[PDB]
Amino acid sequence: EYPTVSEIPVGEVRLYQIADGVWSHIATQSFDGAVYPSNGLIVRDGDELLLIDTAWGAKNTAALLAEIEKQIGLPVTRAVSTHFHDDRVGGVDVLRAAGVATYASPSTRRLAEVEGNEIPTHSLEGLSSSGDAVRFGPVELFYPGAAHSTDNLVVYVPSASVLYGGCAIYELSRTSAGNVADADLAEWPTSIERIQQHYPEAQFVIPGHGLPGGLDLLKHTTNVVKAHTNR
């Protein structure tokens, strides 16, 4: 069973092995009154680990980098932030202090700075226009276009057919739409289509938040997006 938010004390962080050499990480943070869980990804790269998105904040991220050492016992070497919000770049400072080389599209770095969020050090070139793609070690890095944010990226592990959608995909539990404060509601369904086309073989689908599912997580999200459009 996958961790639910009611069993993760704040500042704590669990793992969950999807596949041989592919894990998710699961944290919590509280935001004006409530509790929300956040997913990242950990991909084995030979004898190194590649981390996808922070555990949402310095403290959580410090913790996540301790659990990896105890449980998997390999070094996290490179890190990618799938978008500029604090559940993704939150902890970039910590990671870099810890020997991790940190990455993000130039598009994401620019919005993070404007927002004031922490800014990954390196710049990922070649995903400025949809539906762009570049390879980064054990994964491919995909720009489907504007959706939950204008810069959002998505990740695929071919080795294990795991696709990580980030906050541009919701879990089925999520029926109403979230902070679409930075969203491009206009293009969000279009941009999901690009995803569906680029990875039809994907067996596990992991959203930014909550319970994994299959590729039917995409149609779920498109439905909730359009509902909100006409609100």
Ligand SMILES: O=C(O)c1nccn1Cc1ccccc1
């Ligand atoms: O929607 C998101 O991606 C998001 N990131 C941070 C907070 N949210 C809202 C959210 C998060 C979890 C459950 C419901 C709503």
Ligand SMILES: [Zn+2]
């Ligand atoms: Zn976001």
Ligand SMILES: [Zn+2]
């Ligand atoms: Zn989010």
Ligand SMILES: [Zn+2]
């Ligand atoms: Zn649905």
